[PDB]
Amino acid sequence: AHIEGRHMKRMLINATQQEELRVALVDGQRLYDLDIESPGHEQKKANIYKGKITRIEPSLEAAFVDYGAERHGFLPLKEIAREYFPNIKDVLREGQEVIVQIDKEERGNKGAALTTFISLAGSYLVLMPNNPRAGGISRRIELKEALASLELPEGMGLIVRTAGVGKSAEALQWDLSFRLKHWEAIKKAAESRPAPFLIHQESNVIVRAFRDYLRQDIGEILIDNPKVLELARQHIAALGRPDFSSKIKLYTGEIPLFSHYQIESQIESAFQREVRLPSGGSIVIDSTEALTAIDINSARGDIEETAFNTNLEAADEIARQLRLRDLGGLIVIDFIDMTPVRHQRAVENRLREAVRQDRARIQISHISRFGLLEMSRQRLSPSLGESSHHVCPRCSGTGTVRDNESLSLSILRLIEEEALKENTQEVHAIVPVPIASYLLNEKRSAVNAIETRQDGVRCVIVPNDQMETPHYHVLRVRKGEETPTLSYMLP
Amino acid sequence: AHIEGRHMKRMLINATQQEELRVALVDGQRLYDLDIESPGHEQKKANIYKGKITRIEPSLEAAFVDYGAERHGFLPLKEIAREYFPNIKDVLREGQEVIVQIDKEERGNKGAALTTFISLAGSYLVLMPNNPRAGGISRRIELKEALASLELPEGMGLIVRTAGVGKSAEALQWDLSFRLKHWEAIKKAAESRPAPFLIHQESNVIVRAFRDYLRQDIGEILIDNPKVLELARQHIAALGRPDFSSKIKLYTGEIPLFSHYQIESQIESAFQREVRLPSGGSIVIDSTEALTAIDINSARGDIEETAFNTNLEAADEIARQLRLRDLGGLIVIDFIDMTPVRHQRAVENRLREAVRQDRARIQISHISRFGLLEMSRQRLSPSLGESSHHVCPRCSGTGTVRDNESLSLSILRLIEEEALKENTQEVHAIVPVPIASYLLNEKRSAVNAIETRQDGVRCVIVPNDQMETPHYHVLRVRKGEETPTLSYMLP
Amino acid sequence: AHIEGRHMKRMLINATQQEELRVALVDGQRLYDLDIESPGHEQKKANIYKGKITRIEPSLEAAFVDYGAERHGFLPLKEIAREYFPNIKDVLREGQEVIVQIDKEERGNKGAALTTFISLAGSYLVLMPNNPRAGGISRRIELKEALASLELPEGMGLIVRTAGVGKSAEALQWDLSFRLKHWEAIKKAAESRPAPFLIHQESNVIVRAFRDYLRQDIGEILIDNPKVLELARQHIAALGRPDFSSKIKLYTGEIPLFSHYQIESQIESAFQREVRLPSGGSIVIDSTEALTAIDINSARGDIEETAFNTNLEAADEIARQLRLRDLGGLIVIDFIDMTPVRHQRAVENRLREAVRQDRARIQISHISRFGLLEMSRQRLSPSLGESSHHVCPRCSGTGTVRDNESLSLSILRLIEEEALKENTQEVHAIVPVPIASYLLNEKRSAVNAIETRQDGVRCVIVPNDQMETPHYHVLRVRKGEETPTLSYMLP
Amino acid sequence: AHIEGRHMKRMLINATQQEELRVALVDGQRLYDLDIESPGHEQKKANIYKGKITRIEPSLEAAFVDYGAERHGFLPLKEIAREYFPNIKDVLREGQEVIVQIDKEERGNKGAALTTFISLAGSYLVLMPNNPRAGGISRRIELKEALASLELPEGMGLIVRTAGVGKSAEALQWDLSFRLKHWEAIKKAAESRPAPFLIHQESNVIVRAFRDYLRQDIGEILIDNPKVLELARQHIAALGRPDFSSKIKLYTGEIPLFSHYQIESQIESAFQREVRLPSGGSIVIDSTEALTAIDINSARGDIEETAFNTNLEAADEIARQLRLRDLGGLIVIDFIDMTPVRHQRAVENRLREAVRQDRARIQISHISRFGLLEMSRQRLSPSLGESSHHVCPRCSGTGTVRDNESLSLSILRLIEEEALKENTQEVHAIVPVPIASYLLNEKRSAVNAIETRQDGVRCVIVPNDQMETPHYHVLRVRKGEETPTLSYMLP
RNA sequence: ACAGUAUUUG
RNA sequence: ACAGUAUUUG
RNA sequence: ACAGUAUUUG
RNA sequence: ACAGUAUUUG
Ligand SMILES: [Mg+2]
Ligand SMILES: [Mg+2]
Ligand SMILES: [Mg+2]
Ligand SMILES: [Mg+2]
Ligand SMILES: [Mg+2]
Ligand SMILES: [Mg+2]
Ligand SMILES: [Zn+2]
Ligand SMILES: [Zn+2]
């Protein structure tokens, strides 16, 4: 029934649990975005090291870097600067010491994009202290005015946040001040040493939150744990939006905060693969290796509507999940199938208009002739899956598991073929129990069959209870090289 | 290196193994399509029953049917006929007895499409003995001529197969003969009884093969098992392409047939999720709930090419897998990312030109601005996954598994919330072992924490070794209704 | 180094843990007997019900009884009384209502001995209020005098405890008083109702202890838990040895009581099968179905001594374990093997002199010519094993497990023999995994072998991971009665 | 119903199965002794090596020997000879090279008795070619005559087998010939080399059988496998009892030999712990570490008899099992409990008279006053248990398993005590799952309880599913030396 | 296997 | 398989 | 968080 | 805890 503005939008902080410090942004009781920072596996994006270059490969158009973790980090010739600046190899003289920062974070293989293009964020500003090229405003929005009046040095260009819109030129000075004043240290704190090492560490979840996600609509900030609420308050001081010290309250209620604001289930919502649409429909969000791929579908009085209407809900919800899951990359949405075009353009907008908030960039094509709508969106941090799951290790990634016989027939032809391989003595499949059962009954005859022909080739087939139903081995044992050792000792 | 026509295209039949009768269609040694019919789980599509109608729902635009299995079968008002014919409810008078056939087969939920629009296939013909509306030819291709000269009765219209192109009008008579002559029986064999029952059973894999997949290019038909080769031969007789009795030879070689033609690995190929591209690239074929979704990617001298070239291979291979997997529905292909448009149109065609064969219909849009190419293709039978796998039952479908702590924190808030629920005595999470470990150490304090506050609420938390890492229960035990019974007895 | 009398003998009570209330009797720091009463599985021996008689069997020389639990209770014609008294059947008129008490307790099969011969114990006395036949004194020990002066009614006879030896005739009156005064109620509290039901419940462990195990040598009684120490004190009051209120002190020390008195390990000692002898020898206490059977053996300067000496230690220790384990029945001790007879008579006495305490009766023959010394001892309550263990359920009782092959050969001949049994179709061994492995490799040939001969008898052999290494089934499947169902589905 | 002599006594050989060559000795259909030789784990007793002496210990009264396997072998000063002969140390000069043979075989610890007192067995004779001291006859039985007439050299003395009783002096010459003629080689075949090595290998099971267990009563010798029956026949030739070539027949019957002679079950009989007595009684044969211990008990018309009679059956059966199990050492039999002494002496004899056969020596005392009858018997080879089982590895030997709580309480006090141990940080019980469950619910409070007091001592308690119910660890973690690492990662 | 095939629809 | 066999003894 | 943002790229 | 206690006996 929801109209933005009806109830109060508040920022619920949840500092009760050590191993997990959550921060939802709720409007009334509709969770509408959430964050879960937890020690150890902290935030790395937005840091700044010093850098020398493992290896210029050109077959990609960029170096790598040692900023010294595990995997040296990706660095596109595009990233590279005036100042680093004395096609690839003429550009970067290798083992060169450079001031690289992290655009996008380790993803299962890759390093991370670094970029010698350092960016710096205050509450209302953002410094590019290293290319006076790019500036601007919150493409979200007097200060256009005030901005000129900005006393900017020339090496770099700047933007002005969505959230400086309230505020007063005086203090953009008072931002663009404290930035620089960093940026300086952030400079000479490299002029120091051999660079192979960190320099600045992007600040925790809360600050970040008080920084990047706080607006005029934010009613209260209930924090549920007095000692945080401590730093809580000090952190505004600095970040400096101090018309919010008002705004920041301590939750006492015995009933757990989030669990009070009735947004718990919503939290989960985000970890489930299906997600119910108001009407009663559903939104199954499957994630492939090429693109996340959401599919939509309907409940249980009209057809045309049923679909059209349920598509609109799907629209709304998909957006929110997009946010909750920190889903990035492409996304293909399979909207139901309505006939009248107006509906298509209808829902399309519906989507657009619903992802208006999303702090990340979002691009949204028309609906296809196969009724798929593709849609990109920017990789603001690691996604929930990518950072709170892993890979059903029975499957490998895929979520099916080969029916027992078709596996066995298979294991079995493998055996036979192995058992021709000139100069084999034994050969020793080692397979999930039922596999071994099925080969040795259902199929015994065949196995037999073999050794008869393959004169004198023993095909051992030992059933085992460690193996699950898709894994297995088929080793082969060359003349002479054969233990006498028990079938079941084989392992 | 492959040019169609270089080596001989042959049909390898493999009748050695009872529980699995395979039939690849190979051109030289490149498997290029394959079939695996196995008893029991036989073929159902293309059958013909008699039919009465469980329930007209109109909120879909069609009935259902009892042709008497498990799930009565889908029947679109579109399907419905003149003759059944006395918007939905005025159309189908319910419990009406009708002559329905099966377009598309049981899929995990659905019934199957039936269609009162019976279709009938000979070797060169295909009878529509029930709408003289639709006719035509093999949109693949003198007989245009011969076809008129066809002595067709009027109730129905016909097509002429790709494969009657060789042959002679005389014998289209001699097809369109034996069809009808069926179609008659196929008619009065309903005039018989209460209809709730089968009528005609689509014939096995081999016949089918000798029927639907045999052309002029087919060199030999090596069958590897004398007794089949028996029926083998008799089946041409009838189907009646007898200039092939020549063509059909018995394989003796000790080394297993397929394993001789060096097409084994290829067989598998089709069951793996990644599949290597010639160059050395790879084609990961992930399947979601909305669309199958293939992603492509490259090896280890130029960029532009590396991608462009590897895309072409992906093209080729995707086609073949599309066929081998009997993949239907939509498919989204994430081709690498080349800049020059010519390349895009290049690969696109490449794809088109490579799926020229595919017996199923295929539609192929341009490459998107997000560099996805979407692509539909017709559901010719059940897909390999859909009929030789199942659902990594540790995951549910999805192939990740929630990291242990984030689960535990979760299980745990559930407990707490349950333990407020006014009028609870005990409450009894029952969770995967490590879950129970982690809640009871790492987190003990918190659990404690609870019962302290929740005065006198026992939260039992019994670790169990039956449960795997994502499943678990959190039952709650109402005042009075509490056994005294051992923590570990809980189950 | 231990001389009785050196250090103080004290009674350590341990009431900290709810589910287990222990009471050791220590002399210095040598645990010398211990008790472990724990709720639920409480003490039943020494109770008194009312009784009617399920069934006179005479093929044993006694009835049974309903005192109404599970197994009606054993009742020897020997037990039976004057007053019950109107060879077996002439004696007990069946369904007769009687005042039976419990000599010895449920043992895995048996009921328990009841006895219509009720016995009653005070602190210094013991009433036989139902046969003036048997009287006496503590065959352990002026009162001989005082005892005559006892104002005894005539229906029954009495004894005087080891512990009335201190005390004064006045108060044996004051015992033999409060007894009777019970015994009366204990009488008319049957004159009440239909008897099928309890009457008096033998009192808990502590009272019992303050009653049956308290002497002049008992220095303190440290109890470690204030609230018990409460009832603690009240319980002397009554039982009435009140020159002990002095004696009974509260333990505070942070370090756990028993764990302070340095008698913990000793506790366990009693649950282990081997038990180290001072010198360094060992005492393996194995328990069979016919007799508990202790074996002795030696360490690592003389032979003759080494053995003789180590036998003496074994003597000492065996006694104590005999007590700790509440071991009853026969016991055979295999003392080392010394040559000189003096040593044999030496150790024998050593044993005698060491089991002087044992509250239970003990009888001790000479050492045999096979150098076994047999030895009976009275069943004072259930034994530790019999009440705190169970039966290595992999073995059945026996503690070996048949080597894998000898089992398999066996399972296998079973199969063959089953497979002759005229009119069998299938037959379906179902066996521990490795069993199934070994039969199907190592032995395949043989299995084959069978079906060849046993024309057309399928011997299925399904390996299974539920079964451990000694269990298994060999079902057989009669012509006609054969599912087609998967080898591994068999279960 | 069995009277010795009624049916034919025959020797069934069973050479069908490679991994197990059995040889029962049956009288009619009553298995009455059996043998199971199987390759690899062959027979070692009765071999002859050459020998030098690892280490004279005197604290035992004998050396050891290197005859070079694993454990050098026991060698009693008693064993030692004239000829080895230049109290212990003056006797055996160490590292001396000697001609030792094996009396009794490796038993779980020990070496084996060797004995420089070599013994040698023909069919009718037995050479002591190394002490003319000991001679004699079959204390089982003209030849007394013939024996003098024996042309014996003087260094050694001899006996004459039970089975030379048939036969003729001529041929005792013809035995005592071929012996010596060995004994010579058996001598100079040491005069050869450095002794550290074998010399003569006691011959397989069959020969042995044709040698040590063949008498006049032996009707046939059915062997069931033509090729054996081969060597079969040749082996008499040599051993030389050739009036038996007659006697030795080939079994053909399709139904398995033993399984035909209806003695299968009997085979097993011997591996079960209970064994039914004719009447319907039972004989539970439990084996301890001190003595094998058989207990007896009765069925379901008189008492006195019931017992007396059932004791007689037990007698019979015990004997046979004694033989089948190759049970050696002491044995204590708990016969039922009859009153009249005649019965005791009755059964006693019954036993004596029934173990008349037993090839091993047997000694049998009167029945005790506790109604145990002890009984020694000679260790003719390893016992069935000792060579075809192992140790229910859940128990350790003992066949009970400590009830779950009493374990947990225990594990738990261990924890607490560990957690006082000055200078501990963490401490980390690791226990069977249910153990961990029970400590963490049932008992949580207490565990808590601890850390509260033990200020700042973390007691981790990780449940684990590898451990079964009696095993477990309680490690302790010293200040400073503490990983931060997950509860469930602990292992 | 046909211009309404294919996709979609239970 | 013997009067010192057997049991025991590592 | 800016017209070159985002997607892509290890 | 007694001279018929204890062992045994379901
Ligand atoms: Mg890609
Ligand atoms: Mg997937
Ligand atoms: Mg859909
Ligand atoms: Mg008994
Ligand atoms: Mg045992
Ligand atoms: Mg011993
Ligand atoms: Zn999975
Ligand atoms: Zn066991």
Phi, then psi, of D419 in degrees rounded to 5: -100, -10
Please report, as a single letter, which amino acid is at residue A392.
Answer: C
Strand E contact at CB of residue B212, distance < 7 A: yes
Cβ(B190)–Cβ(B219) under 8 Å?
A: no
| Nearest nucleotide from residue B369 CA, by C1' atom | G7
Cα of A394 to ligand 2 centre, how many Å? 13
Closest-CA distance of chain D to residue C31, Å: 17
Selecting from C442, C448, C487 the residue whose C-beta is nearest the C-beta of A437 gives C487
* DSSP-assigned beta bridge partners for residue A11: A25
Tell me, what DSSP letter sits at residue B387? G
Tell me, what DSSP letter sits at residue B269? H
Number of H helices, E strands in chain B: 12, 23
Q: Round and report the angstrom distance from CA (C403) to C1' (H8).
A: 37
Instruction: List Cβ neighbours of C426 (8 Å cut-off, separation of 6 or more).
Output: C457, C458, C459, C460, C476, C477, C482
Residues of C in contact with D369 (CB under 8 A): 365
**HEC letters along chain C:** CCCCCCCCEEEEEECCCCCCEEEEEEECCEECCCCEECCCCCCCCCCEECEECCCCECCCCEEEEECCCCCCEEEECCCCCCCCCCCHHHHCCCCCCECCEECCCCCCCCCCCEECCCCEECCCEEEECCCCCCCCCCCCCCHHHHHHCCCCCCCCEEEECCCCCCCCHHHHHHHHHHHHHHHHHHHHHHHCCCCCCEEECCCCHHHHHHHHCCCCCECCEEECCHHHHHHHHHHHHHHCCCCCCCCEEECCCCCCHHHHCCCHHHHHHCCCCCCECCCCCEEEEEECCCCEEEEEECCCCCHHHHHHHHHHHHHHHHHHHHHHCCCCEEEEEECCCCCCHHHHHHHHHHHHHHCCCCCCCEEECCCCCCCCEEEEECCCCCCCHHHCCCCCCCCCCCCCCCCHHHHHHHHHHHHHHHHHCCCEEEEEEEEEHHHHHHHHCCCHHHHHHHHHHCCCCEEEEEEECCCCCCCCEEEEEECCCCCCCCHHHCC
User: A87-109 burial by CB neighbour count: b if 16+ within 10 A, else e?
Assistant: eeeebbeeeebbbbbbbbbbeee
Phi, then psi, of C284 in degrees rounded to 5: -80, 115
- Cα D427 to Cα D482: distance, rounded to the nearest angstrom: 10
Closest-CA distance of chain A to residue B187, Å: 36
Positive or negative, the CA dihedral B266, B268, B273, B274 is: negative
Instruction: Extract the tokens encoding B227.
Output: 């007794």
Q: Round and report the angstrom distance from CA (C74) to C1' (H9).
A: 9
Cβ(B198)–Cβ(B172) under 8 Å?
A: no
Positive or negative, the CA dihedral B355, B360, B366, B368 is: negative
Chain D interface, mutation test: which of B441, B443, B450, B477, most D Cβ atoms within 10 Å?
B441
Q: Please, is C430 exposed, middle or buried when counting C-beta atoms within 10 Å of its C-beta (0-12, 13-18, 19+)? A: buried
Chain D interface, mutation test: which of B412, B430, B444, B489, most D Cβ atoms within 10 Å?
B444
Residue A13, phi-psi category: left (phi > 0), alpha (psi -120 to 50), beta (remainder): beta
CB contact under 8 A, C284 and D290: yes
**HEC letters along chain A:** CCCCCCCCEEEEEECCCCCCEEEEEEECCEECCCCEECCCCCCCCCCEECEECCCCECCCCEEEEECCCCCCEEEECCCCCCCCCCCHHHHCCCCCCECCEECCCCCCCCCCCEECCCCEECCCEEEECCCCCCCCCCCCCCHHHHHHCCCCCCCCEEEECCCCCCCCHHHHHHHHHHHHHHHHHHHHHHHCCCCCCEEECCCCHHHHHHHHCCCCCECCEEECCHHHHHHHHHHHHHHCCCCCCCCEEECCCCCCHHHHCCCHHHHHHCCCCCCECCCCCEEEEEECCCCEEEEEECCCCCHHHHHHHHHHHHHHHHHHHHHHCCCCEEEEEECCCCCCHHHHHHHHHHHHHHCCCCCCCEEECCCCCCCCEEEEECCCCCCCHHHCCCCCCCCCCCCCCCCHHHHHHHHHHHHHHHHHCCCEEEEEEEEEHHHHHHHHCCCHHHHHHHHHHCCCCEEEEEEECCCCCCCCEEEEEECCCCCCCCHHHCC
- Cα D325 to Cα D360: distance, rounded to the nearest angstrom: 12
- Cα A386 to Cα B406: distance, rounded to the nearest angstrom: 13
- Count other C-beta atoms under 10 Å from residue C144's C-beta: 9
Instruction: Extract the tokens encoding B244.
Output: 């092939």
- Cα C364 to Cα C374: distance, rounded to the nearest angstrom: 7
| Closest alpha carbon within chain C to A462 | C437
Instruction: List Cβ neighbours of D378 (8 Å cut-off, separation of 6 or more).
Output: D328, D360, D361, D362
User: A22-48 burial by CB neighbour count: b if 16+ within 10 A, else e?
Assistant: bbbbbbbeebbbbbbbbeeeebebbbb
| Nearest nucleotide from residue A109 CA, by C1' atom | G10
Residues of D in contact with C306 (CB under 8 A): 59
* DSSP-assigned beta bridge partners for residue B475: B428
Phi, then psi, of B286 in degrees rounded to 5: -90, 140
Cα of A292 to ligand 2 centre, how many Å? 10
* DSSP-assigned beta bridge partners for residue D480: none
Phi, then psi, of C308 in degrees rounded to 5: -45, -55
Closest-CA distance of chain A to residue C398, Å: 25
Strand G contact at CB of residue B298, distance < 7 A: yes
Residues of D in contact with B431 (CB under 8 A): none
Instruction: Extract the tokens encoding A90.
Output: 């003429």
- Cα A358 to Cα A354: distance, rounded to the nearest angstrom: 9
Cβ(B176)–Cβ(B126) under 8 Å?
A: no
C284 touches chain D (CB under 8 A): yes
Instruction: List Cβ neighbours of B480 (8 Å cut-off, separation of 6 or more).
Output: B425
Instruction: Extract the tokens encoding B126.
Output: 């295909």
Q: Which helix (H) or strand (E) holds B425?
A: strand B424-432
Selecting from A438, A461, A464 the residue whose C-beta is nearest the C-beta of C486 gives A438
CB contact under 8 A, A416 and B256: yes
Domains, chain D? 1-388 (no CATH), 389-491 (3.40.1260.20)
State the virtual CA torsion across C312, C316, C318, C324 in degrees, nearest 10: -170
Instruction: Extract the tokens encoding B18.
Output: 């009872």
Minimum-distance residue to E5 (CA–C1'): B361
Breaks in chain D after residues (C–N exceeding 2.5 Å): 86, 141, 300
- Cα A255 to Cα A13: distance, rounded to the nearest angstrom: 14
| DSSP string computed for D69-110 | SSS-EEEETTT--STT---HHHH--SS--B--EESS---SS-
D461 touches chain B (CB under 8 A): yes
E-assigned strands of D180-328?
Answer: 198-200, 221-223, 248-250, 282-287, 292-297
- Cα A396 to Cα C309: distance, rounded to the nearest angstrom: 67
Q: Please, is C85 exposed, middle or buried when counting C-beta atoms within 10 Å of its C-beta (0-12, 13-18, 19+)? A: exposed
* DSSP-assigned beta bridge partners for residue C24: C12
Angle at CA of residue A175, ends A173 and A176, nearest 5°: 65
D437 touches chain B (CB under 8 A): yes
CB contact under 8 A, D434 and B488: yes
Which residue's entry shows tokens 């000679």?
D378
Report how far apart, in Å, the C-alpha atoms of A427 and of each of A418, A455, B327, D258 are.
7, 13, 35, 35
Hey, which chains touch C, using 3+ CB pairs under 8 Å? A, D
| Nearest nucleotide from residue D337 CA, by C1' atom | H8
Strand E contact at CB of residue B110, distance < 7 A: yes
The number of the ligand nearest the C-alpha atom of C335 reads 6
Cβ(B112)–Cβ(B152) under 8 Å?
A: no
Minimum-distance residue to G9 (CA–C1'): A60
- Cα C146 to Cα C154: distance, rounded to the nearest angstrom: 17
Instruction: Extract the tokens encoding D298.
Output: 């009765």
A458-464 and A424-432: which strand pairing? parallel
Residues of C in contact with D409 (CB under 8 A): 17, 19-20
| Nearest nucleotide from residue C164 CA, by C1' atom | H1
A376 touches chain B (CB under 8 A): yes
Instruction: Extract the tokens encoding A445.
Output: 């005859």
Residues of D in contact with C370 (CB under 8 A): 330, 363, 365, 374-376
Tell me, what DSSP letter sits at residue B222? E
Residues 94-113 of A with CB under 7 A from strand G: 103-104, 107, 109-113
* DSSP-assigned beta bridge partners for residue B114: B102
Instruction: Extract the tokens encoding D278.
Output: 């004719």
Cα of B273 to ligand 7 centre, how many Å? 13
User: B61-86 burial by CB neighbour count: b if 16+ within 10 A, else e?
Assistant: ebbbbbbeeeebbbbbeebbeeebee
C404 touches chain A (CB under 8 A): yes
Residues of A in contact with C460 (CB under 8 A): 441
CB contact under 8 A, D433 and B486: no
Instruction: Extract the tokens encoding C39.
Output: 């709720």
| Closest alpha carbon within chain B to D459 | B441
B402 touches chain A (CB under 8 A): yes
CB contact under 8 A, B488 and D461: no
Alpha helices (H) along B213-282: 226-239, 257-260, 264-269
Minimum-distance residue to G5 (CA–C1'): A361
Cβ(C411)–Cβ(C467) under 8 Å?
A: no
Angle at CA of residue A50, ends A47 and A51, nearest 5°: 115
* Long-range contacts (CB closer than 8 Å, 24 or more residues apart) made by D295-304: D295/C288, D295/C289, D295/C290, D295/C291, D295/D333, D295/D334, D296/C290, D296/D333, D296/D334, D296/D335, D296/D336, D297/D336, D298/D336, D301/C59, D303/C59, D303/C60, D303/C61, D304/D338, D304/D339, D304/D340, D304/D343
Say how many Å lie between the first and final Cα of chain B, rounded.
Answer: 62
Instruction: List Cβ neighbours of C307 (8 Å cut-off, separation of 6 or more).
Output: C298, C336, C337, C338
- Cα C398 to Cα D392: distance, rounded to the nearest angstrom: 8
Phi, then psi, of A200 in degrees rounded to 5: -150, 140
Q: Which helix (H) or strand (E) holds B363?
A: strand B362-364
* Long-range contacts (CB closer than 8 Å, 24 or more residues apart) made by D343-347: D343/D304, D343/D308, D343/D311, D346/D308, D346/D312, D347/D308, D347/D311, D347/D312, D347/D315
B452 touches chain D (CB under 8 A): no
Hey, which chains touch B, using 3+ CB pairs under 8 Å? A, D
Report how far apart, in Å, the C-alpha atoms of A232 and of each of A15, A18, B345, D233 are.
11, 16, 56, 100
Instruction: Extract the tokens encoding B216.
Output: 């002029």
Tell me, what DSSP letter sits at residue D52? B
